[PDB]
C-alpha cells in the first residue's frame, strides 16, 4: 500500500489520491496557474521599465518558459526536492522526473506531482527575473545556455537551502515564507553581478499592464505556498494584498517629497512590487497590522536604493535590484522581527516565532540566509558569466 | 473550543478549520482572485470608451485598489461585516482587522478572514467606478482623499443595509446576490451626482481588452457569491455567462436599427456589460431561460438611456451611470419576478421567491431597496463632492 | 431520492450536491473559467499572425462567444451530452436547457449544471477558429448565421462521436483525452474547407500576448479534461506544460536551420501552440517523458505545413489548419502509441492502453477516428459555406 518513497505505491493495487485532501490539493493546482501569469508580469513590468531595447523582453519571458521547463523536467527538480539529498544539493534521483508521481513531497500535503507542477513555477520566474537583466544586446542562442546553466549551479542550491529536504536554513531555524530568498534575492544579486562585469508615456501600459498581472499572480505565490486549502491560505493573501497597497502608497508619496511635488505614476507601480516581494518571505507568518510596515518599509528602502542609479551611474539591471534584492532583503530582515508564532500555528504550523514573542536569536538565523544567499548568488552567477564571454561563438553580450 | 464570536478560538488549543468544508474556502479563496481583475476591467473598458483625457484611468484603477484596500483594513470591513452593528451600519469592532480570523462570518460557511478578503473586492471595483467619472482633470492628491471618504459614508451604509448582519434590506425580504445595489446603483447614481455639480479606433482594442477583463472575472463576482462550493456557484455562472451573451446580441441588433444599419463593435461590448450589471441581483435567483431577458431588457433599457447624452448633452461619467446605475436598477427590478425560490433552493437557501412564485410582495420590497440605494448614493454623494471643491488647496476639479 | 435521470431529484426533498466531491466541482468551475481566456487567446493570437485585415478579429472573438452559448443554451448541449442519445448524435431531450441540473453527467462525477459550463466553453473556443479562418472581408450579420448552423452540424456531431453517451469513437476503443478531435482537427480541417472555395513588430505582442492567453488557459483545457480533483488533473498539467516547452524550442531550432541562421521570434509562440495541440489528446494518457515527443514531432511536422504556402499559395485560414488540424492528426496518432493504462489508472481510469503496453490495436481505432472527424469536418463545412453564398442578401465574403 502507501510507501511514502518513491512513486509511493501501484495505480493498480492501491488508490494514491487517499494521502490528500482534495481541496488542498485542488487549491495548489488553482494556485499553479497563478504563478505562471507572473512571468508576462516580469516582461511586460520590465520591457515597460526600460528607460533604454535589443528585443522585446516579454517575449523573452516565452524563451525562460521554455527553457525553465525543460531544465525543471531535466534535473532541476531533482536537486531541489528529492528524499534522499545530502544538506547543500539534493539527488539526482528524479532525472528527467521519472518516479515522481504519488508519495506526498517535501510539503507533506500535496503529491510530487504536483509540487512539481507548483515549484516549477518559481524557477521560470526566477529564470525572467534573470534574462530581463542581461537582454541589452545580448546574444539569444548562448542565453537559453546562459539561463540552463544558471538554473542548475545557482538557483537549485540555494532553493534546496530553503525549501529541501535537509537543507541546512531549514534545520537552522531560519524563515522563509514563498522564497523571498531563493527568488528575489538569488536574482537580485545575480542582476548585480550582470551590471558589473558584462554591464514616457508609449511604454507605461506595459509596466502598468504588466504590474497588474503580478499583483494578479502573486495571490497564488504567497496564498498557495501554504500548501493547504486551510484558512492560514487567504490570511496570508490578506497579508499580500496589502502590503502591496501600502507599499505603492508610500512610494507615491515620497517622490512627491524628494522631488518638490513630482508626479510619479510609475512610482506606485513600483511601490506595489517593492512591497510584494517585501511581504514574500513574511506572509504567512506575521500579524496583518505589521503586514502594513512590509509595505512602507521596502518602499522607501527601495526608493533611495534607485537613486544609487547616478552615484554609479549603470543601469542594465539594477532596476531588478532595486527592488527584488533590496526589497527580498529588507522583508528578509522584518520576518525575523514580526514572525508570530500563533499565526503560523492557523494550519498547525509549529515555529519558535520571531522578536513577536521574544525569541531573540532568531534575527540572527533570518541575517544568516539572506547572506549566504546573496553571495552564493553573486560569486557563482559572477565564475559563470565570465568564463562565458571567455569562448567567442557563445557570447553573452557583444 | 469553538465560540463564534472573535477569532472563534485558540490557534493553539483548537483547529479553526473543523468548521468549514475546504472545497468552499476553495473556491472563494479562486473567486477572490478573480473578482480582483476586474478593476483593470473597468480601466481599460473605460479608458477606452472615452470619447475625450487627464491621466490613463488603467493606471487610476491601480490607484483604487490601494485606497480601497487601506480604507477596508482601516474600518471598511468593520463597518459592513460586524457581527454586533446596529441595523444602518455596523460596529468598528475590526478598526485595523483585529480579531478577524475564524469566526464564521455574515456568510456563515467561511471564516471572517477569507470573508474580509473576497468581499474587499467588492469595494474595490466599486472605487473604480467611482474614480472612473470624475477622472476629467480632476487633481489627484484629493482623489484620493474622496475615494477613502466617499468609501466609508456612501459604501459602507448602502452594503451594511444589504449584506450586513442587522441590515434593514435582509430583514425586510428584499433578494440582491452578488450586489447590483452596493456596487452597480450605488456607483451608477454617484456618478451622475458628479456629472451635475462637477461636470474611433486607436483605443478600440482597449475596450474589448478591458471588456473581455470584466466577462472573465465576473465568473468570480456572481459564482462566488453562493459562498460555496454547491452546485449552485456553477449555476450562476451558466445563468451570468448567458445574460452577457444575449445581453450583447440585443444592444448590437438595436443600434443596427436605429441608426439606418450603423456598425457597432462597442455596441456588443457595452451589451455585454449591459447584461453582466443586469443579473448581478438575480444570478442566484432566476431559472436559466429567464436569464436571456436579464440579457435583454436591460442592453434595450440602457441603449435609450446612452441616448440622453443629447437631450442633456453632458458625458463625463454618463458612461457609468448608463450601465451600471440603470442596467441595476432594470435588473434589481426584475429579480422581483423572475426570483424562484426553487433554484435558491439548490443549496438549501430558503426565499419566498418573487412572482415565479405568486409571492407578488417582492416586487415591492425590490423597489424598497434600489429606491433607498440610489438616493442615499446621490444626496450623500453630492454633500461631500461640493464640501469638497469647497476648500482651495484640495481640489477636485479645476 | 437520487435518480440519476432528469434533474436528479427533489431540491425540497433532497440535497443534490451529495453525489459528488466539492473538491471536483471546484476544480472544473476554476477549469471552466480557464478555458474561456483562450478564446481572446486565438483572437489574439490571429489577428497579430496575420500577414494580410477587415476587422480586429480580437473583437470577433468576443462575436463568437455570444453566438456560442446562444446555441449551446439553445439545443448545443443536448445533442451532445444528453442521457438518451442514440449512437451519431444525442436527442433533443435538453432543448433550451430544460431539466439541466444536478443529475450526474456522461462525465459521472460533476452535475449536468456543471458539465454544462465546463463543455460550453469547448464550443466556444472551436467558434473562434472558425470565425478566425474567414474573417477576411466577410459580412458580419451572415457570419453569425453561418457559425450557429456550423455549431451544430459540423462541431456537435463529431463532439458527440467522442465524448457522448452513445457515442461510437468512445465504444470502439478510441482515446481522445481533452479533444485534439473535436476541436482542433473539426477546426483545422473546416478552416481548409474555407480556405478553397470561400479563398513585422506592431503586431507582434498581439500574437505574442495572445499565445500567453492560451498558454495560461490550457491548464483549465487539459487539467480539468480528468474530471475530478484528481492527482492525474495536475500530472496532465505537467504533461500540457512541456509539450508547449519543448514544442516551441524544436520550432525555433528549425527554422534557425532551413533559413540560414534566421530570426524567428514568431517561431516559439507558434511552436508552443504548435504542442499544446499537440498534447491535447493525450495529455491524461501518456508519460511525461514521452510528452517532450509531443512537442517536438508535431512542431516539426507542423513547420512544414506552414511551407505549402507556397507550393498552392493561399493564405486566408492556412495558418489554422497548420497548427490545429496537422499538429492535432499528428497528436492523434501519438496517442496510439504512447498511451499507458497505468497513467490512466491515477483515477482508476481504465483503458486498455496503446503501444507502450502492446495493445497493436490501438492506434487503428485512432486512426478511426482522426478520418471520421476530418472528414465530416470537410463535407459537412463545406456543403453549408457553398450554399450560403448561394443567397445574395446572406452573404459571406463578397
Redo the contacts between chains.
Keep these: 500500500q502507501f510507501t511514502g518513497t518513491g512513486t509511493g505505491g501501484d495505480?493498480?493495487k492501491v488508490?494514491?489520491?487517499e494521502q490528500?485532501?482534495?481541496?488542498?490539493?485542488?487549491?495548489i493546482?488553482?494556485a499553479?496557474?497563478?504563478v505562471?501569469?507572473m512571468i508576462?508580469g516580469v516582461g511586460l513590468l520590465y520591457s515597460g521599465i526600460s528607460r533604454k531595447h535589443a528585443?522585446?523582453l516579454?517575449?523573452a519571458a516565452?524563451?525562460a518558459?521554455?527553457?525553465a521547463?525543460?531544465q525543471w523536467?531535466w534535473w532541476g527538480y531533482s536537486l531541489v526536492f528529492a528524499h534522499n539529498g545530502s544538506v547543500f544539493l539534493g539527488t539526482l534521483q528524479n532525472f528527467?522526473?521519472?518516479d515522481?508521481?504519488?508519495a506526498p513531497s517535501i510539503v507533506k500535503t500535496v503529491?510530487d506531482?504536483?509540487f512539481?507542477?507548483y515549484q516549477?513555477m518559481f524557477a521560470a520566474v526566477t529564470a525572467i527575473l534573470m534574462a530581463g537583466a542581461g537582454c541589452e544586446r545580448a546574444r539569444?542562442g548562448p542565453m537559453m545556455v546562459f539561463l540552463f546553466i544558471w538554473l542548475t549551479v545557482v538557483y537549485c542550491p540555494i532553493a534546496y537551502w530553503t525549501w529541501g529536504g535537509n537543507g541546512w536554513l531549514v534545520s537552522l531555524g531560519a524563515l522563509d515564507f514563498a522564497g523571498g530568498g531563493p527568488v528575489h534575492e538569488n536574482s537580485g544579486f545575480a542582476a548585480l553581478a550582470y551590471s558589473l562585469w558584462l554591464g514616457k508615456?508609449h511604454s507605461?501600459?506595459s509596466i502598468?499592464?504588466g504590474?497588474?498581472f503580478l499583483?494578479?499572480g502573486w495571490?497564488?505565490f504567497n496564498?498557495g505556498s501554504t500548501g493547504?486549502?486551510?484558512?492560514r491560505?487567504?490570511?496570508a493573501?490578506?497579508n499580500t494584498?496589502?502590503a502591496?497597497?501600502?507599499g505603492?502608497?508610500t512610494w507615491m508619496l515620497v517622490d512627491w517629497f524628494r522631488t518638490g511635488g513630482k508626479?510619479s505614476?510609475v512610482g506606485?507601480?513600483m511601490g506595489?512590487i517593492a512591497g510584494l516581494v517585501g511581504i514574500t518571505p513574511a506572509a504567512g507568518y506575521v500579524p496583518?497590522?505589521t503586514s502594513?510596515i512590509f509595505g512602507i518599509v521596502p518602499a522607501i528602502i527601495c526608493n533611495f536604493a534607485v537613486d544609487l542609479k547616478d552615484l554609479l551611474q549603470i543601469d542594465d539591471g539594477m532596476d531588478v535590484w532595486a527592488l527584488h534584492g533590496v526589497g527580498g532583503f529588507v522583508g528578509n530582515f522584518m520576518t525575523g522581527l514580526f514572525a508570530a508564532d500563533?499565526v503560523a500555528?492557523?494550519?498547525?504550523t509549529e515555529i519558535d516565532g520571531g522578536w513577536m514573542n521574544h525569541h531573540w536569536k532568531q534575527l540572527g538565523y533570518q541575517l544568516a540566509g539572506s547572506c549566504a544567499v546573496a553571495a552564493w548568488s553573486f560569486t557563482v552567477t559572477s565564475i559563470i558569466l565570465l568564463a562565458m564571454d571567455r569562448i567567442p561563438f557563445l557570447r553573452i553580450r557583444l
Tied chains: 1, 2, 3.
Excluded: E, H, Q
Excluded at 228 to 231: D, K, T, Y
Design positions: 495505480v493498480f488508490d494514491l489520491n490528500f485532501d482534495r481541496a488542498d490539493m485542488v487549491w493546482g488553482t499553479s496557474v497563478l505562471w501569469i508576462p528585443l522585446s516579454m517575449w516565452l524563451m518558459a521554455c527553457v521547463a525543460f523536467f528527467c522526473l521519472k515522481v508521481l504519488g503529491p506531482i504536483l512539481c507542477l516549477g539569444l508615456p507605461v501600459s502598468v499592464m504590474t497588474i499583483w494578479f495571490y497564488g496564498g493547504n486549502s486551510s484558512m491560505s487567504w490570511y493573501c490578506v494584498n496589502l502591496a497597497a501600502t505603492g502608497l508626479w505614476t506606485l507601480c506595489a496583518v497590522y502594513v500563533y500555528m492557523i494550519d498547525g
